[PDB]
Paper text:
PgcA has been shown to play an important role in EET but is unusual in containing three CXXCH heme binding motifs that are separated by repeated (PT)x motifs, suggested to enhance binding to mineral surfaces. The amino acid sequence of PgcA contains a cleavable Sec signal peptide followed by an N‐terminal lipid anchor and four domains interspersed by repeated (PT)x motifs. The first domain is not predicted to contain any cofactors, while the other three domains are monoheme domains (Fernandes et al., 2023). Furthermore, we demonstrate a distinct role for its domain III as a mineral reductase that is recharged by domains I and II. These findings show PgcA to be the first of a new class of electron transfer proteins, with redox centers separated by some nanometers but tethered together by flexible linkers, facilitating electron transfer through a tethered diffusion mechanism rather than a fixed, closely packed electron transfer chain.
The 1.9 Å crystal structure of heme domain III was composed of PgcA residues 444–511 and is significantly different from those of domains I and II. First, the coordination of the iron atom within the c‐type heme is bis‐His (His459 and His491), as commonly observed in multiheme cytochromes. Second, no acidic side chain is observed near the distal ligating histidine residue. Domain III contains only three α‐helices despite its molecular weight being ~1 kDa larger than those of the preceding two domains. In fact, a greater fraction of its polypeptide chain forms loops that likely possess greater flexibility when unrestricted by crystallization. This crystal structure also shows that 33% of the total surface area of the c‐type heme moiety is solvent exposed, which is substantially larger than the 25% exposure of the hemes in domains I and II. The domain III spectrum is a small g max, rhombic type LS signal (g max 3.08) typical of bis‐histidine coordinated hemes with near parallel ligand orientation. Domains I and II specifically displayed much greater pH dependence, while domain III only shifted by ~10 mV, which is surprising considering the higher solvent accessibility of the domain III heme. We observed that triheme PgcA and domain III bind to akageneite with similar affinity, while neither domains I or II bind at all. While these experiments cannot distinguish between inter‐ and intra‐PgcA electron transfer pathways, these observations show clearly that domain III directly reduces iron(III) oxides, while domains I and II are able to recharge domain III for further electron transfer.
Residue numbers in the entry: 3 to 72, 76 to 80
Write the structure that this text describes.
């Protein structure tokens, strides 16, 4: 789940959000430890937040990515 979750985060939330030290640029909240807020903010297949629609697989993969990476290329 971790790699497709990165694609979800990268293309769909990073433009605004931050995530630990992996992504420290953006004005919206840092999504570190936001799994429960993500699942409350999004319903699988229902268009919502910022025009985004997420599949069930998207939501699971993204949370696995947030848990595993939420960081420096040399660490
Ligand atoms: C800019 C167009 C954004 C995009 C792209 C994403 N998010 Fe967002 N998010 C944005 C703002 C300005 C805010 C604060 C106002 C609000 O609507 O809450 C948020 C907030 C969240 C939250 C809740 C934050 C908290 O309670 O601390 C969550 C859980 C969240 N956003 C999730 C989220 C996800 C999973 C995204 C990728 C699919 C995503 N956002 C994109 C702005 C923007
Ligand atoms: Na960002
Ligand atoms: Na949900």
């Amino acid at each position: 789940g971790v790699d497709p979750g990165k694609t979800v985060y990268d293309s769909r939330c990073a433009s605004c959000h931050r995530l630990g030290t992996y992504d420290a640029s953006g004005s919206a909240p840092n999504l570190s430890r936001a799994g429960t807020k993500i699942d409350g903010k999004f319903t699988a297949g229902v268009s919502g937040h910022k025009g985004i629609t997420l599949t069930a697989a998207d939501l699971a993969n993204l949370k696995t990515f947030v848990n595993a990476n939420g960081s420096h290329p040399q660490f």
